[PDB]
């Protein structure tokens, strides 16, 4: 099975699987950079390696230097994480290749849910329900275009299968695909574009799935990402408030399906749009995500210990039938940022405060004396609150973010605070666009 695995992420990711590894007796290899030498997960490591200078494009994507950190270690196994190379096909093809496990899908299967148009064709395949679209790529026959647009109806949105825009008149399709189209490959290489019926309020819904190396595959409910800025998601919640049990079932098992078709392998997720009742597929990541911790909380399952177990050739080490959903999960991301201009805010921790008691988690590799760096991302921390319903949950975040003290650098627990008492949010149901909205 894994003996070593490298580490090849940073922040409060890589200390969540440092802590995997340690509770399996795995050893561990932290890869990191010149300014990542301080990180909790490096200190706590079994081995550390400077894959090179602070910037991610000489460090934590730099495919030559992490392998070469696997070969020298005799490590069996690569920890990816979220981000940097873990959608990456050709850095997973270069792993196997050189002998090692990537932790995450196969190369294969990363490249055909990596290209969307590929990954809609596999989920139409599967049974589960997609966006009324092109059902493949638009030609540059405009006649055949405009048919396929008023169809489904305007609004209609363009994507990317390898940057989107959303055509809401047939006076501005023609010229509105040739644009996405010339954006792509001389941005993404690939020239390959789709139109989807574009809906205009609806609702973010992911279902976390795992499946194994033993044809076995799981659904652990879904996440509500909706309360998000300008793509980037500020608090998350499990279950999805008004998705039932028997609806979870129905495309929960959909998507369990499809993993076994498509030889799918390890922790996974299904992005849905959801709107007026209805499912609509969208895309899919082949890797843990950062809200990962709001399902553990809601099923006791270790997603991370899973992705290690699933890596070694083990099963899942439990059914479908082992699964219920008790309670509700809230996670804020706690960033290193200004609560209104988002700007960046990094620098010297002075003093932190953690909170904690009953259903109180807090996944962070910040400690009193730690510097924010300015290289990377501005997450610091997450909270993660349970509670028997999704109103304690929310008073639980509430009283978890007035004990949380950061001194030295501005944070967004305002921005937080302000969201858990939004009567809307209280409700629940909030669609995509809303705290851009309530931040006029
Ligand atoms: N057909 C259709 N209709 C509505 C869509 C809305 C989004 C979306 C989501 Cl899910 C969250 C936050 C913003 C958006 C978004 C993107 C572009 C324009 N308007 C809204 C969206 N996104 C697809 C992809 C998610 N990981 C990022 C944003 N795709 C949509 N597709």
């Not at 890869?31 to 030498?37: E, F, G, L």
């Not at 196969?106 to 148009?117: E, Q, W």
């Not at 209805?278 to 890797?287: C, P, S, V």
């Amino acid at each position: 099975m894994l003996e070593k695995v490298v580490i090849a992420n940073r922040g409060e990711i890589a200390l969540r699987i440092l802590r995997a590894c340690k509770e399996l007796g795995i050893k561990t290899v932290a890869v990191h950079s010149t300014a990542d030498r301080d990180l909790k997960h490096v200190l706590l490591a079994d081995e550390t390696i400077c894959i090179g200078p602070a910037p991610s494009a000489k460090s934590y994507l730099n495919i030559p230097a992490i392998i070469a950190a696997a070969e020298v270690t005799g490590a069996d196994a690569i920890h990816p994480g979220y981000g940097f190379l873990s959608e990456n096909a050709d850095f997973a093809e270069q792993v196997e290749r050189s002998g090692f496990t990537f932790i995450g899908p196969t190369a294969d299967v990363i490249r055909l849910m990596g290209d969307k148009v590929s990954a809609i064709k596999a989920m139409k395949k599967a049974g589960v329900p997609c966006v009324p679209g092109s059902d493949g790529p638009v030609s540059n026959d405009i006649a055949k275009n405009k048919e396929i647009a008023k169809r489904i109806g305007y609004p209609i949105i363009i994507k990317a299968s390898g940057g989107m825009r959303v055509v809401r008149s047939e006076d501005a399709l023609e010229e509105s695909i040739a644009m996405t189209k010339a954006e792509a490959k001389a941005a993404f290489n690939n020239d390959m574009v789709y139109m989807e019926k574009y809906l205009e309020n609806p609702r973010h819904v992911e279902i976390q799935v795992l499946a194994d190396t033993h044809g076995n595959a799981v659904y652990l409910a879904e996440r509500d990402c909706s309360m998000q800025r300008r793509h980037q998601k500020v608090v998350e919640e499990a279950p999805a408030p008004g998705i039932t049990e028997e609806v979870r079932r129905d495309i929960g098992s959909r998507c369990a399906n499809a993993c076994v078709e498509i030889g799918y392998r390890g922790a996974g997720t299904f992005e849905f749009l959801y709107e007026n009742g209805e499912f609509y597929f969208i895309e899919m990541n082949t890797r843990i995500q950062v809200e990962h911790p709001v399902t553990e909380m809601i099923t006791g399952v270790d997603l991370v210990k899973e992705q290690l177990r699933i890596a070694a050739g083990l099963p899942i080490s439990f059914k479908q039938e082992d699964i219920k959903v008790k309670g509700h999960a809230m996670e804020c991301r706690i960033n290193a940022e200004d609560p209104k201009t988002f700007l960046p805010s990094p620098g010297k921790v002075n003093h932190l405060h953690s909170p904690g008691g009953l259903g109180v988690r807090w996944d962070s590799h910040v400690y009193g004396g730690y510097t924010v760096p300015p290289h990377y991302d501005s997450m610091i921390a997450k909270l993660i609150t349970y509670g028997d319903t999704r109103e304690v949950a929310i008073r639980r975040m509430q009283n978890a973010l007035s004990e949380t003290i950061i001194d030295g650098i501005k944070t967004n627990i305002p921005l937080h605070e302000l969201i858990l008492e939004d009567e809307n949010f209280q409700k629940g149901g909030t669609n995509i666009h809303y705290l851009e909205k309530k931040l006029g």
